[PDB]
Amino acid sequence: MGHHHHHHSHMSHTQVIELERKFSHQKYLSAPERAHLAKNLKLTETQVKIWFQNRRYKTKRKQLSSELG
Incomplete structure (x- = not known):
C-alpha cells in the first residue's frame, strides 16, 4: 500500500492565489481545512x-x- 499518485502538482496561477488566501489567514492546515x-x-x-x-x-x-527553498 501507499500513495497511488504523487508529485509536485503543476497547479493553475489563479488556483495558487486561493492557496495563498488560505495561507495568509492560517499557515498550517489540519485534515478538515x-x-x-x-x-x-x-x-x-x-x-x-x-x-x-x-x-x-x-x-x-x-x-x-x-x-529560502
Missing part, C-alpha cells in the same frame, strides 16, 4: 499539504540562516 481547500480547488490533501510545506520552507524563518 486541507480536505476542504482540496475539494474547493479539486486538488488532493497530499498536493495541498506539499504546497503549505514548501511555502513555509521557502519563507524567511528564524534559524542560523534564512530558509
Whole structure:
C-alpha cells in the first residue's frame, strides 16, 4: 500500500492565489481545512499539504540562516 499518485502538482496561477488566501489567514492546515481547500480547488490533501510545506520552507524563518527553498 501507499500513495497511488504523487508529485509536485503543476497547479493553475489563479488556483495558487486561493492557496495563498488560505495561507495568509492560517499557515498550517489540519485534515478538515486541507480536505476542504482540496475539494474547493479539486486538488488532493497530499498536493495541498506539499504546497503549505514548501511555502513555509521557502519563507524567511528564524534559524542560523534564512530558509529560502
